[PDB]
Design an enzyme around this catalytic site. Structure first.
Site, PDB file in Angstrom:
ATOM      1  N   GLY A  90      33.399  45.236  14.758  1.00 46.49           N
ATOM      2  CA  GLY A  90      32.451  46.340  14.709  1.00 46.49           C
ATOM      3  C   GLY A  90      32.466  47.043  13.361  1.00 46.49           C
ATOM      4  O   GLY A  90      33.082  46.518  12.431  1.00 46.49           O
ATOM      5  N   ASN A  91      31.829  48.224  13.276  1.00 49.28           N
ATOM      6  CA  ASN A  91      31.683  48.989  12.025  1.00 49.28           C
ATOM      7  C   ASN A  91      31.080  48.132  10.951  1.00 49.28           C
ATOM      8  O   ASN A  91      31.717  47.873   9.914  1.00 49.28           O
ATOM      9  CB  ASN A  91      33.007  49.569  11.525  1.00 49.28           C
ATOM     10  CG  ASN A  91      33.474  50.740  12.360  1.00 49.28           C
ATOM     11  OD1 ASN A  91      32.746  51.720  12.555  1.00 49.28           O
ATOM     12  ND2 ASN A  91      34.693  50.646  12.865  1.00 49.28           N
ATOM     13  N   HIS A 117      28.750  42.108   6.464  1.00 48.25           N
ATOM     14  CA  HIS A 117      28.574  41.303   7.650  1.00 48.25           C
ATOM     15  C   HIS A 117      27.193  40.699   7.741  1.00 48.25           C
ATOM     16  O   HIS A 117      27.044  39.600   8.256  1.00 48.25           O
ATOM     17  CB  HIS A 117      28.835  42.159   8.870  1.00 48.25           C
ATOM     18  CG  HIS A 117      30.170  42.819   8.843  1.00 48.25           C
ATOM     19  ND1 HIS A 117      30.415  43.962   8.117  1.00 48.25           N
ATOM     20  CD2 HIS A 117      31.342  42.482   9.429  1.00 48.25           C
ATOM     21  CE1 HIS A 117      31.680  44.310   8.273  1.00 48.25           C
ATOM     22  NE2 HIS A 117      32.262  43.428   9.063  1.00 48.25           N
ATOM     23  N   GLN A 120      45.412  42.763  17.481  1.00 43.42           N
ATOM     24  CA  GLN A 120      45.567  42.821  16.019  1.00 43.42           C
ATOM     25  C   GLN A 120      45.624  44.248  15.487  1.00 43.42           C
ATOM     26  O   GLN A 120      45.432  45.207  16.236  1.00 43.42           O
ATOM     27  CB  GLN A 120      44.490  42.005  15.285  1.00 43.42           C
ATOM     28  CG  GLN A 120      43.128  42.598  15.278  1.00 43.42           C
ATOM     29  CD  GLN A 120      42.021  41.527  15.192  1.00 43.42           C
ATOM     30  OE1 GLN A 120      41.754  40.827  16.177  1.00 43.42           O
ATOM     31  NE2 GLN A 120      41.363  41.414  14.014  1.00 43.42           N
ATOM     32  N   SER A 147      34.211  50.178  -3.561  1.00 40.29           N
ATOM     33  CA  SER A 147      34.443  51.593  -3.739  1.00 40.29           C
ATOM     34  C   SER A 147      35.022  51.800  -5.133  1.00 40.29           C
ATOM     35  O   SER A 147      34.684  52.769  -5.829  1.00 40.29           O
ATOM     36  CB  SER A 147      35.446  52.074  -2.698  1.00 40.29           C
ATOM     37  OG  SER A 147      36.749  51.565  -2.990  1.00 40.29           O
TER      38      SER A 147
END
EC number: 6.3.2.1
Lengths: 285, 285
Positions: B33-34, B39, B63, B190
């Site tokens: 997710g996120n 992705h 995990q 970043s």
């Protein structure tokens, strides 16, 4: 005409074709040196699929001690004779260096926890890991619809069933009941040191076991009492009770409110011969 | 055509069975997710390689939930889905924990890849990679894709999954997807926000130096110690300060050998206040 394959790529090629042809497939996993037991497995698989694949692989990973391994019977030709007679479609019989090109050290493994270290597992580190790893690999390889195992290795059978659930394999795992004599006795090697008189008595073990099944299937839950009755019944017939256990067939742990299946394990002596048997039974839905 | 979102294994199982008997070629992208544009690139690759694309969203408790530095605000399941609906995905699989592990983690069967799971990132997170291979193997068996996409950034994961696929004989194509990069080569990160405008003109040199290394490798030059030494010269003279440059076997994460087939080049270098970081796969000729 039976096909004998020994490498992963050839086989996979066939597995692909079998899909396109829309055929339902059964796998019977074995370690070769086959006999009547295995033939029954093969019958059972033939009865439930269009195509039957039998694997013959002496699997180093499940061998506890290095000696046992060296001295495991290899008999490829006669194995194939028996399978060919039984109209088997595919034999998969790879070499060790095909399955484990770089030995066991870095091999990816599949472990079923609890089941694999209890009972026979406790005295045999690594054995059951070997069993689940190779069956797992075989499943991914062959992608059968159905797989057959003998009921005699009740622990293996539970190992695999627990694996298939946890790992989400869409495969029907079929436990095949052992070959018995008309009188109930488990057909086995041990049946050699049975004097004509002990042979007459031998079937007592399976009767004693069925009396336990009867009691359990109806709502009998006085387990210790049940077991003690069983010990005595055996001693009276002339055996000497070695061990009698009732366990949950799926977890191999103690029966609980919630068990749906029980497994009955018994071992008892007859003169100098130690007969063992087992039986699975449905208690709930 | 409308995207389907499935919460439950049996509903998933049903569509999957249906997809096989239509013989539609299926692609899988497993995720925690996120989702971000990273992705989406995976999704694109999958779409390009298959009739049907399935994305799975499952925050897997076996995990470690390592944080993505590209993500700056957490996501909602509905957000993730909206992204996916746009990017033209066929099925989303989004189960709750109790569905995947209805009885917890204690007895859950696991798949474990030796060495790759305990080295580097895994040395410091016992059990992490074991959770990754397990959930992935389980997704594999439940879904049976023909191909599966993983991003090149998390390179250990990609080697771990490749090793599992080989060892466990999965007939799945594992497609490593290269990272998203600015037009000029620079990895999106970043970290970039830490460059000055002038240092941003220089940043693309890290990619460059890396290609220089690949070309050398592709051209059979196995004199590593000095290939690397040149790269350090080259970067320091560009204004970087090389910190860590490494070349390993992409499948073992150890050293190249006469038999290595793929290499991974791993590099970090300071520019201003920014520690730039990059990796790149190389196919050995």
């Amino acid at each position: 005409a039976m096909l004998i394959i020994e490498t992963l790529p050839l086989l996979r090629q066939h597995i692909r074709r079998l899909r396109q042809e829309g055929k339902r497939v059964a796998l019977v996993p074995t370690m070769g040196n086959l006999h009547d037991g295995h033939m029954k497995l093969v019958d059972e698989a033939k009865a439930r699929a269009d195509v039957v694949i039998v694997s013959i692989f002496v699997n180093p990973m499940q061998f506890d001690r290095p000696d046992d391994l060296v001295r495991y019977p290899r008999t490829l030709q006669e194995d194939c004779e028996k399978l060919n007679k039984r109209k088997v479609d595919y034999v998969f019989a790879p070499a060790v260096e095909e399955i484990y090109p770089h030995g066991l050290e870095g091999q990816t493994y599949v472990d079923v926890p609890g089941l694999s270290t209890m009972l026979e597992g406790a005295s045999r580190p690594g054995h059951f890991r070997g069993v689940s790893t190779i069956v797992s690999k075989l499943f991914n390889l062959i992608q059968p619809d159905i797989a057959c195992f003998g009921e005699k290795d009740f622990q293996q059978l539970a190992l695999i069933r627990k694996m298939v659930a946890d790992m989400s394999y869409d495969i029907e795992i079929v436990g095949v009941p052992i070959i018995r004599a008309k009188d109930g006795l488990a057909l086995s090697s041990r049946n050699a040191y049975l004097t004509a008189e002990q042979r007459k008595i031998a079937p007592g073990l399976y009767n004693v076991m069925n009396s336990i099944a009867e009691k359990l299937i109806a709502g009998n839950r006085e387990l210790q009492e049940i077991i003690a009755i069983a010990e005595q019944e055996l001693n009276e017939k002339g055996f000497r009770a070695d061990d009698i256990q009732i366990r949950d067939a799926d977890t191999l742990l103690e029966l609980t409110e919630t068990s749906k299946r029980a497994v009955i394990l018994a071992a008892a002596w007859l003169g100098q011969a130690r007969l063992i048997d087992n039986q699975s039974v449905t208690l709930a839905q």
